[PDB]
Amino acid sequence: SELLVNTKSGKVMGTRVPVLSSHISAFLGIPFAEPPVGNMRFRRPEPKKPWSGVWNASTYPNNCQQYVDEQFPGFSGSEMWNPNREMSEDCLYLNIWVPSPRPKSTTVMVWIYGGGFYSGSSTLDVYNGKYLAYTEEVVLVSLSYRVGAFGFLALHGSQEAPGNVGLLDQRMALQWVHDNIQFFGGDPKTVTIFGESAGGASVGMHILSPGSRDLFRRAILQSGSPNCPWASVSVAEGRRRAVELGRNLNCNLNSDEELIHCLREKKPQELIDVEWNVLPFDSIFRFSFVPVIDGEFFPTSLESMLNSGNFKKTQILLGVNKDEGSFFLLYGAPGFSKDSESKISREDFMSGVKLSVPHANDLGLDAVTLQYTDWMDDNNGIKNRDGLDDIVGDHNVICPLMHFVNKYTKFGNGTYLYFFNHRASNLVWPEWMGVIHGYEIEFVFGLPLVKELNYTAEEEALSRRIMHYWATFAKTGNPNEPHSQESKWPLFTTKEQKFIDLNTEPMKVHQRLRVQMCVFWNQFLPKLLNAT
Amino acid sequence: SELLVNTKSGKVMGTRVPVLSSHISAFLGIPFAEPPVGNMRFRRPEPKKPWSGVWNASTYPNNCQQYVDEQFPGFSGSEMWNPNREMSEDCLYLNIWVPSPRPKSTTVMVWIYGGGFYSGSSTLDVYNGKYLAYTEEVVLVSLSYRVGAFGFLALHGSQEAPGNVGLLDQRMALQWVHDNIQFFGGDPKTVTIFGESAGGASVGMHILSPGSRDLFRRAILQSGSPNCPWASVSVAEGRRRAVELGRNLNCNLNSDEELIHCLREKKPQELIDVEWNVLPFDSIFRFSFVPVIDGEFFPTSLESMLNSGNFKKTQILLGVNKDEGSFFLLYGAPGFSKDSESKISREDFMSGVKLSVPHANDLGLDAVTLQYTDWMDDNNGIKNRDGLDDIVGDHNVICPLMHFVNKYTKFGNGTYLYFFNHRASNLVWPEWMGVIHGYEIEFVFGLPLVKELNYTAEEEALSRRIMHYWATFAKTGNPNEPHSQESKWPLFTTKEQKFIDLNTEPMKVHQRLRVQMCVFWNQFLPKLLNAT
């Protein structure tokens, strides 16, 4: 039977699903690691012991234990991201979408969801790989990993909570796709991993980490990269937050065993209730428990790794959204409202800069404000709002990614950069937000193709274009069709630095994506803060 | 006789001169102080003892002993500034241009020439007050003062070379215009002093100095102000350069008397031959001997004086030229040539920034370069040239003047700002220089009116407009005609900050003259250098 597959871990019974008035196979909820519950909390994942009989993989699995957003109850805008399944500490499962008929050895794509390393589920509606699998004819895999404290608590030096266990989770899933995707019709020697936000950062982290390099062929990073100021911390800070977390739940802090044991006896929702209290600064776009440069998963510092060419040299396709920042200002910077034009005053603009660059001294706060203020119109509410919006995006997503792409391209075998600047027609968020963080995803998974979702004809045209770029890239290492008559997406090169816009308009190539600011954030500000 | 005048210092015989096919009186070379020669060198000026008989004042006087430019022998472009008379240590004389018939009590205008405090003469062709005196019907006075070491050597604490004796010279001349201009038809209670470059800085200095305030009514400052980074030094630096100067001429440096005496025995051209060796840094737009904040001429620091409102509150009319910098890059920054488009490379651009901001550490040099580089076109020869050109002007003339005007206007009784952005049609310097430093002067003195000088009809129209603004301002404290139908030159106010362009086009009012950069140079860079 087409729905029965025999993996090295046991047999699995998938289910047939409808898509665009046709059908494909779907094996949902396949396990890849032993349940990380009980004494296994904070501990590295262990391979799932084989099983007898047929594993029923026809329904989604549970979602990892996480923080849930309730800033806008009912609002589909924010809930389409909350977990749609029962949260449980038993979350390590993966989902496979296979074409019909089953391929012999087709291309594989592994999606690592994002969420600031503190949330995220594979089961979300927006991450439904059937449209993509079907339209491009590729095996679509969707893995999950532990987030928040459960996956990133780090007491370096111990084996009870080494840290990065959440990244190991992802690696585990990739190991399984490597040892078994062949039985689903996929070619293990051609797996493309791709992610968004924290997922884009994770993808970049497997490219740097020696122990993950051999497990994939290409990569696609979206709106995120390993060297983002929010994507990692030092063992020292990781330790500081580990303790503080414990201090909030009143735990014995005499030794790590002392602490770790107390944390394992707590209910999942208790660590989550105090999780946000451990941040060092009043900030925006910063998360509690994240990956830590431990010396294991990451040999040395990330910067020196990028400078020494110590990383998987392959091809990569990456890009950013026009308005990455807006989403965080809404939730945290004073002055922004989901229901107003949110024009920001001088007072609020500056409180904004203080919240955005939390580690900068007073001299730096001035350097940032000077670089982002049109003194010929300093009290223009719309200008201060878009400027604040820009600071958040440039510092957190756009300028850190350009540093990566430029360092990478110097040792890589092909780079393709994009700039998604199209706001969907059916967005429910205000206009002042614009091309919001994460909304390029719906085009990658092709939700525009399903009529009932209400997308313009040109938008659906854009979705197919993008799916064909991603899919063609995953297969060939080049987003372009061999002998096509369509516009060629130029290659990014240290010299030229070309890139393209991605919207419903005639492809336009450009150069040096936001260099003016990328120099301020990657060269000057770092230097300024060091000398002062 | 109309040409014979009886001053309180003695009688003087002037001469009748032709102007625009008519005639006016001219009393050239009237003395106002005792010859500062011999043991009087470096010493404060002393009032000129009265004289019997008639002083012959029909020919120009001598020019102060100064450094002469020979970077372009023959070139009228640079020689129209060199001294046109016999240089002599006996230089303190003033020139008066009186209308005909002699007025009873008309308006007076005293011009203080510029020259970086190291050169300058009243006798230059460009400073011929007959055209102005005649066209506007005002008594035009032109004084002179000692420059270079001869007028600014400063060994604070001694009476042999207190410092600022050059500014005292100017004050002396103003005292004489105050005690005698009435006998030439001028009204002593309505004297406007106006200057250019170092003259604009001197004008501003009499506004701050308690001992000069009572000697004039209004002021006009052009392309220069008291708080310019080149217009003054501390007693400490003044002392350091005094000694070094002595060290270059091999003088006994055991005591001030030791030093001062050795310097008085040297020929004038010997101090001048080594004058430039005493600068602390390799620089551009910096001069050896200049005014020093001594605690006498200037009660306290200039910044605190401007902040406390400690200065003559009156009306002032000031402005800058579009391209103040170019003149100094030509002579000192590597890459510029009087005979080429002078496109500048990255290497030379940066050597440029190092020469322009001599006191900045490596962090500041980066801050300046980042603020002035279009990273989307960093190797554009014309862009780096105009950027370097801009840095020199903004830092030295334009941004320091805007700091003054903004601090002044807060306690003044009327401010009028202009922006001269018209390049004369008959200029002999290359185009890349543009609206060059000091060339707005020819319009103030009306050289466009004399046909044979080859100026366009519209240029002459501009000269008359400007002469009428300056003259009307000198008389009324407002550049505008009471009930005129012409375009009104708006008043500068802390709130609006309006200003006008001054060229052959329909008057256009603007706001916040170069605020983007004026904030970098007046607020951020100062602060940056302090913390680092």
UniProtKB/Swiss-Prot annotation, chains A, B:
Disulfide bonds: C64-C91, C251-C262, C399-C518
The species this protein was found in: Tetronarce californica (Pacific electric ray)
Keyword Hydrolase (UniProt): yes
Phenotype for S197V: Loss of activity
Function: Terminates signal transduction at the neuromuscular junction by rapid hydrolysis of the acetylcholine released into the synaptic cleft. May be involved in cell-cell interactions.
Glycosylated residues (UniProt): N56, N413, N454, N530
Gene3D superfamilies documented for this protein: alpha/beta hydrolase (3.40.50.1820)
Family assignment from sequence similarity: Belongs to the type-B carboxylesterase/lipase family.
Regulation: Inhibited by substrate concentrations above 0.5 mM.
GO molecular function terms attached to this record: acetylcholinesterase activity
Official protein name in the record: Acetylcholinesterase
Tissue specificity annotation: Found in the synapses and to a lower extent in extrajunctional areas of muscle and nerve, and on erythrocyte membranes.
Assembly with partners or alone: Isoform H form is a homodimer; the asymmetric form is a disulfide-bonded oligomer composed of a collagenic subunit (Q) and a variable number of T catalytic subunits.
UniProt keyword Membrane, yes or no: yes
Keywords from the UniProt entry: Cell membrane, Disulfide bond, Glycoprotein, GPI-anchor, Hydrolase, Lipoprotein, Membrane, Neurotransmitter degradation, Serine esterase, Signal, Synapse
Annotated active site: S197, E324, H437
Catalytic activity of the protein: acetylcholine + H2O = choline + acetate + H(+)
Top-tier EC class: hydrolase
Coiled-coil stretches: none
Impact noted for substituting S197C: Loss of activity
InterPro entries the UniProt entry points to: AB_hydrolase_fold, AChE-related_enzymes, Acylcholinesterase_fish/snake, CarbesteraseB, Carboxylesterase_B_AS, Carboxylesterase_B_CS, Cholinesterase
GO BP, sorted A to Z: acetylcholine catabolic process in synaptic cleft; choline metabolic process
GO CC field: extracellular space; plasma membrane; side of membrane; synapse; synaptic cleft
PTM description: An interchain disulfide bond is present in what becomes position 593 of the T isoform.
Protein EC: 3.1.1.7
One Pfam family of this chain: COesterase
